[PDB]
Amino acid sequence: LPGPLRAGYYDLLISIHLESACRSRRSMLSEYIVPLTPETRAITLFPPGRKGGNARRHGLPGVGVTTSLRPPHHFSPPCFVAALPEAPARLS
Amino acid sequence: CTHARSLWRLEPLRISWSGSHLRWGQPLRIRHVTTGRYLALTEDQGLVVVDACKAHTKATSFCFRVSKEKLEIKYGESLCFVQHVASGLWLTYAAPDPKALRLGVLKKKAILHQEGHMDDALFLTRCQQEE
Amino acid sequence: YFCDQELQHRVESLAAFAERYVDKLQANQRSRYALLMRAFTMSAAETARRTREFRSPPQEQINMLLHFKDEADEEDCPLPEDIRQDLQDFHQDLLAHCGIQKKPQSLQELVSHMVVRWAQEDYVQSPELVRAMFSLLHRQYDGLGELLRALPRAYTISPSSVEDTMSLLECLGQIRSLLIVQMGPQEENLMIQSIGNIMNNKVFYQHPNLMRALGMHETVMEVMVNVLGIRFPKMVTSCCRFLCYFCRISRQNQRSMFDHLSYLLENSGIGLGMQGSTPLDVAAASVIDNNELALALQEQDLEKVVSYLAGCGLQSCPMLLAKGYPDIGWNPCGGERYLDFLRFAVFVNGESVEENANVVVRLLIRKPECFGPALRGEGGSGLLAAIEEAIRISEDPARDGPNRVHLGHAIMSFYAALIDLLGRCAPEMHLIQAGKGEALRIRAILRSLVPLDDLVGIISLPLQIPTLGKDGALVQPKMSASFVPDHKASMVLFLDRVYGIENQDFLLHVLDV
Amino acid sequence: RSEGEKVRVGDDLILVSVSSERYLHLSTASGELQVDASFMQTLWNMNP
Amino acid sequence: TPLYNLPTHRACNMFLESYKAAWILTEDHSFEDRMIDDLSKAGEQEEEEEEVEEKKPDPLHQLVLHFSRTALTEKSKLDEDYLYMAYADIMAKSCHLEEGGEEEVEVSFEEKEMEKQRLLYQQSRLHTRGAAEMVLQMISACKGETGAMVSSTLKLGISILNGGNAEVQQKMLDYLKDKKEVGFFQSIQALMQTCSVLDLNAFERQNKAEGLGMVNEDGTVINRQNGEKVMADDEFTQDLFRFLQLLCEGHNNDFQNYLRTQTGNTTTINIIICTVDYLLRLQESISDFYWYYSGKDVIEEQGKRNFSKAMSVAKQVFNSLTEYIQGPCT
Amino acid sequence: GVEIETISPGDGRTFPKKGQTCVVHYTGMLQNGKKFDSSRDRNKPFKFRIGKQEVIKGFEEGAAQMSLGQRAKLTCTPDVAYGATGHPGVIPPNATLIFDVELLNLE
Amino acid sequence: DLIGYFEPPSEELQHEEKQSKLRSLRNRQSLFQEEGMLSLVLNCIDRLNVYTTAAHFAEYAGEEAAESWKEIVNLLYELLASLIRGNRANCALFSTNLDWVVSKLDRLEASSGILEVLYCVLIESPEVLNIIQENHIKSIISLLD
């Protein structure tokens, strides 16, 4: 595929399938509210070495356990045969 | 104050050597740069801007006086009064208008009065060559 | 993205350790309190310990417990050595994780070396890319500062309140999703529904600190600024109701909302004030019942509201003759709201603030047109004449009618509000006995504004007593049209505040009529 | 003119009573020009 | 009242705030000098190639050029920028190490000379890449509006100008004379006009509010207080005059004449007269404070603090006035 | 109404009734052969139930008329379709819809 | 001469000099607009838009005067586009003139010029976007059709 067409199709897919949810989650990511759960208290700042005798070693980012509350995404399957009917706004 | 409507061109009444510095009481003409009209005094609606055909030395001649007394100019902060040549009239504000006040307008019409006021002194500010 | 994930991991670990530490702290405090209560042989020392360590606000107590960072000041902390050692270990672990102390073993080193190498290799020409790399590099060097700035937005909640909280979050998101879209009917309806759902949630009033941290008041104020900068009055009413309720939730919310007082008062107008809850009501809620906020009031806001009062007192209100009511020449109902705001500002907790009262009376005497046709040097109508004229105006429908709004009652309501405002601006009795020059001057000015004869005469005016009239049908005086005793109450408050009771003869004369 | 600036001769002034907080107004309503302390303002010249 | 009876989440929040206020905030980490040194190194661009005359800008040079481009961008008003604040603070701290020093003991002459050379080199690390023009552009773009970015710019300018550096003064003078703009002095005049003085009404209101002392959702103590409402932004008003006095440091008649009259421009602003006017207003405020406190037998602590603040500001203004005429500028 | 024409024969006896669940792989198109719907692109059969009027009346009648395992073509006139108030940006305000449906996995 | 007078600064210049030239162009455009030059150009365009074709104009002014009719129309549209380009106030002045530029979109003479004028107005003024109606969009689609 030509470069402009490739970029256009990628951007079209992102815009029509992922833009709204990404924007909402990006807005929600600013705050850090956390509940008191057994999983919450199990979080350790430093992951201990499996072999042992090793400390102060950072774990890989984005692989631990997160407990901050983030609302889940909502989507509606596309369908152009259902009967056409305040009314809630349509979903992605 | 930034628009082009307030641009006035000074032309000394001397036939040549107009580029020399102005003198107190020297007769001259004031022209509107954008419209091409010349300031003048007439008997029918006082002082107005007229065309070049009707512009004569009897009505279009004005002089810069140091003060209101009857009997060279620094470019800024000179307080040079304006007096019509061959007349004892001076440029001044038309007395405050209640109707103008009603419309809170700033159009303080200009009138040529034999005594004017004490605020008749004014400064001259040169505009850029671009304007 | 990965840096944000690292910061989130750090804050989550901090919260988990906070819970773990606070459990042990509570247990230790319980044990020490039990020891203090059971063993009180050293009664003086026991009393001193109970006064200092206990019987104190929880924040001060926990600040005292955590004041052992330096060994010099560690003597004042009764915490055990093991607990202090545990906190020191956690602090050391946090410092090590933040990077406080070749192959870039860690992400921070890799990012820093990458940014430096990119900068050295070529002269970057894209401003966005340059800003991105420099911001990222600054985050790498200032991770501890980043955590410090991110801490205020951190919050901890109980597991039993998560569900509703999530719902609240969802609603908030919808409101945010409506910021980037131009205002319209559907967006207005969704905003109203989201605001109502925010109203009905229990978490909204259970955790006011959480709502302040999320900054929902700033969001709704931004939306109101957008809609005001009239079309869509319902949305403005909903925003004003939300702000008033938010102020009524807690005192810190009132302090936070007091900052926007200038804009709220500037945007307060007759047209905006005609329908529903108004920004003037928001300002009144932000200023009501708070003494230090009342003292913090600036004189420019009082000048602005006095100017609005004078303006509405000079000319009639456009919608009154738009409906078809006869022209009168001024706006009593418009000025009623300003008078109410002024008396709310002046009078707090049953007492009068002398500074605000003096400023208000100075502005009022500086602009006599605020007093309307009556109490006017050029006019000289008089209180009794004005009230009788209003009564006879309300008696006949030729001038009273054009009803939703009756001008005859409006005249009496406005004059009563003005009299009440002047009454509560009077100085305190203790200042009067103290002989303060300013208090005597203010009292003399108030006595010069209105006389006693008008007060007694207007109090002597009777009412419209509801008579039986027709059998089985009560002929009642329809309210908001006739003379109600509210005017009498406010202005006898004036009489007590300013003139008081001179002697027994005056008291008997007042009681007689 | 502004506050804190020395007053000069031939300068309009506004006089306010300290005790009563009223200007030295010139009343002309009755057809006879009189002076009274009232809320209306009137300019005065203090000529040496 | 007991802490053990509080809910777990509320106690966790209280402990989090206490730990943030008592431990994290008090911890000090120094990274400005190391970051500036790392950014100042050119790497191996000159080693890989030397035929290019201008070579390539240093990473610090690119950073200051980016900030200068943002400042020079035509906008209605200057907007808040946290990154610029952070980098300006880092640079100012980096060049303030020698000035800040980072039972009296006599200091050897040689030690003073080495300290001065160290300060000169630290300032040369910054002003050789465009910081001197950047601070002028940022000040001009502020349009005479009080804010945090103008404070950061003034602090950076003071740090650069510390010790009366002649090179930076020459650079700023050359830039100002070449551009021939009026925004800089207009903004300076506006900022000087917005300076605050002693306020007696605010003092009375603050004293009464302290006398009340009723808590607002904070246990027993109101937890609501600032520096003082009688004199706010005193640090900013000292920084402005410190920057102005550093411009004319060293008896350089060029600045002493440029400040009085800005020749070559369409409008001239007399900064000296503005300083005199501000001093007159401050003197009037101090006289009013003295008149109020004359009746009282003993000055209270709040009055002493207000007097100290006002006298410190007056001292800075007096020093600036001395700087304007220290050289025989007729 | 809806016109039905068979394409491939079905089971022939197991006809759906009200209250059952039917999955269909269909391909909708305009009258001018302008395709706008196809369940094969999503690789997921479309599930619906007869009796809750979730889908247009013509689609329900066509699905109920034909048996299990049958491939048939349905023509839906506008009055049983969206009619004048058609889908904005998808369907013109007056057009008949051609569907190529195939019933499978009746429940 | 006027079209060459209002030429935008080159994109290859330095940032500071480009900004200075942009400021000079903006104030020059404002000075020319405030004196009624834009209204004068609009009046000339309205006067010249009465005649549909060059032959029709020649029926009233002769062939020699009608030889340059299309060139004059194109120059007028280019001058208007240059006057309103990059100026928010000048574009906002077209709030009441939106129909004036829309109704001439289908005209064969200077179609590119009027299209460029409409593009300049739309990309600068939110007000014209707020007052956009269905018929204008239908006309824009008819342009493609």
Curated annotation (Swiss-Prot), chain B:
The organism's place on the tree of life at top rank: Eukaryota
Record PTM: The N-terminus is blocked. Channel activity is modulated by phosphorylation.
Tissue expression as described in the entry: Detected in skeletal muscle (at protein level). Fast- or slow-twitch skeletal muscle.
Location of the MIR domain: 19-71, 72-128
Compartments it resides in: Sarcoplasmic reticulum membrane
Further remark: Binding of [3H]ryanodine indicates that the heterozygous channel is activated by Ca(2+) concentrations 4-fold lower than normal. Single-cell analysis of cotransfected cells shows a significantly increased resting cytoplasmic Ca(2+) level and a significantly reduced luminal Ca(2+) level.
Note on domains (UniProt): The calcium release channel activity resides in the C-terminal region while the remaining part of the protein constitutes the 'foot' structure spanning the junctional gap between the sarcoplasmic reticulum (SR) and the T-tubule. Pore opening is mediated via the cytoplasmic calcium-binding domains that mediate a small rotation of the channel-forming transmembrane regions that then leads to channel opening.
Family: Belongs to the ryanodine receptor (TC 1.A.3.1) family. RYR1 subfamily.
Function, as annotated: Cytosolic calcium-activated calcium channel that mediates the release of Ca(2+) from the sarcoplasmic reticulum into the cytosol and thereby plays a key role in triggering muscle contraction following depolarization of T-tubules. Repeated very high-level exercise increases the open probability of the channel and leads to Ca(2+) leaking into the cytoplasm. Can also mediate the release of Ca(2+) from intracellular stores in neurons, and may thereby promote prolonged Ca(2+) signaling in the brain. Required for normal embryonic development of muscle fibers and skeletal muscle.
Name assigned to this protein: Ryanodine receptor 1
Source organism of this protein record: Oryctolagus cuniculus
Classification lineage: Eukaryota, Metazoa, Chordata, Craniata, Vertebrata
Swiss-Prot record, chain D:
PTM note: The N-terminus is blocked. Channel activity is modulated by phosphorylation.
Distribution of this protein across tissues and organs: Detected in skeletal muscle (at protein level). Fast- or slow-twitch skeletal muscle.
Domain MIR: 4-48
Effect seen on changing residue 8 to C: Decreases threshold for channel activation by K(+), caffeine and 4-chloro-m-cresol. Decreases inhibition by Mg(2+)
Signal peptide span: none
Subcellular location: Sarcoplasmic reticulum membrane
Free-text domain note: The calcium release channel activity resides in the C-terminal region while the remaining part of the protein constitutes the 'foot' structure spanning the junctional gap between the sarcoplasmic reticulum (SR) and the T-tubule. Pore opening is mediated via the cytoplasmic calcium-binding domains that mediate a small rotation of the channel-forming transmembrane regions that then leads to channel opening.
Function: Cytosolic calcium-activated calcium channel that mediates the release of Ca(2+) from the sarcoplasmic reticulum into the cytosol and thereby plays a key role in triggering muscle contraction following depolarization of T-tubules. Repeated very high-level exercise increases the open probability of the channel and leads to Ca(2+) leaking into the cytoplasm. Can also mediate the release of Ca(2+) from intracellular stores in neurons, and may thereby promote prolonged Ca(2+) signaling in the brain. Required for normal embryonic development of muscle fibers and skeletal muscle.
Family per similarity comment: Belongs to the ryanodine receptor (TC 1.A.3.1) family. RYR1 subfamily.
Note from the entry: Binding of [3H]ryanodine indicates that the heterozygous channel is activated by Ca(2+) concentrations 4-fold lower than normal. Single-cell analysis of cotransfected cells shows a significantly increased resting cytoplasmic Ca(2+) level and a significantly reduced luminal Ca(2+) level.
UniProtKB/Swiss-Prot annotation, chain F:
Subunit composition and interactions: Identified in a complex composed of RYR2, FKBP1B, PKA catalytic subunit, PRKAR2A, AKAP6, and the protein phosphatases PP2A and PP1. Interacts directly with RYR2.
Purpose: Has the potential to contribute to the immunosuppressive and toxic effects of FK506 and rapamycin. PPIases accelerate the folding of proteins. It catalyzes the cis-trans isomerization of proline imidic peptide bonds in oligopeptides.
Record organism: Oryctolagus cuniculus (Rabbit)
Protein name, UniProt field: Peptidyl-prolyl cis-trans isomerase FKBP1B
Enzyme class: isomerase
Gene, per the UniProt record: FKBP1B
Activity modulation: Inhibited by both FK506 and rapamycin.
Record domain PPIase FKBP-type: where: 19-107
The EC number(s) this enzyme carries: 5.2.1.8
Catalyzed reaction equations: [protein]-peptidylproline (omega=180) = [protein]-peptidylproline (omega=0)
GO function term, MF aspect, one: peptidyl-prolyl cis-trans isomerase activity
CC terms in the record's Gene Ontology section: intracellular membrane-bounded organelle; sarcoplasmic reticulum membrane; terminal cisterna
